[PDB]
Structures are given as structure tokens and as C-alpha cells.
């Protein structure tokens, strides 16, 4: 069967937004195929605010997360392979999920 990660990602994203929390996505910036501003990468990772307010055209698909965001006013198109998505949680209280290390992503 396919990985459960993308389904759980969508579930927690909606739960976070519906509860007025700001969804923060933790990404492994070293993962193959990741496209993010390297200047904002720290400790091999990057945290991204996925709220509709901080993004544009957000897509949460099975194999990837894609959206536009701004950095110091500059707009860029981010692309995150699902295997690089490590967790999603509330900026406000830390509630969310740290994804299980599903084999298929290794």
C-alpha cells in the first residue's frame, strides 16, 4: 500500500487551520528534489508557515507540497517532495504530528 504521510498531512493541516492555529511544516532541506531558498536553511532543515495568509496556491498532493511564498518580500515557488515533509504543528502550542519514518521515503 501507498504511504499514509500525505493523508495525515492533509488531516492535520485542516485540523490546525480549523482550530485557528498557524500550520508550520518542518522540512528536510537536504532531501532529493527539495526546492527552497537555501539562504533560509538551517541545520539541514527549514520551517515553513503554510497558512493561506503566508502562501499562494498551496497544493497538498500525495507526492509533493507546492506553493508560493515570500521571503523579505521576494516571491518564490517552493516544491517539497512528500518524503522531505517531516512534521506539521501549531505555531501557537506545538500540537500536530511528527511523521513516522515510512520506509518508502528512505
Amino acid at each position: 500500500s501507498s504511504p499514509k504521510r500525505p493523508y495525515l498531512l492533509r488531516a492535520y493541516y485542516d485540523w490546525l487551520v480549523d482550530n485557528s492555529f498557524t500550520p508550520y511544516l518542518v522540512v528536510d532541506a537536504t532531501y532529493l528534489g527539495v526546492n527552497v531558498p537555501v539562504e533560509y536553511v538551517k541545520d539541514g532543515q527549514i520551517v515553513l508557515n503554510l497558512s493561506a495568509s503566508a502562501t499562494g496556491n498551496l497544493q497538498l498532493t500525495n507526492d509533493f507540497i507546492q506553493f508560493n511564498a515570500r521571503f523579505k518580500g521576494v516571491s518564490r515557488e517552493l516544491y517539497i517532495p512528500m518524503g522531505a515533509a517531516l512534521a506539521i504543528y501549531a505555531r501557537e502550542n506545538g500540537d500536530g504530528v511528527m511523521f513516522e519514518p515510512e520506509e518508502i521515503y528512505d
Binding site: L48, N49, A54, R91
Partner: peptide, 11 residues
Amino acid sequence: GRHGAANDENY
């Protein structure tokens, strides 16, 4: 002093 995310709060 709480650190936020990398991208700007508003797109």
C-alpha cells in the same frame, strides 16, 4: 522572543 517560520507571515 518566539522565533517564527522562514517565510514572511503575509504573501
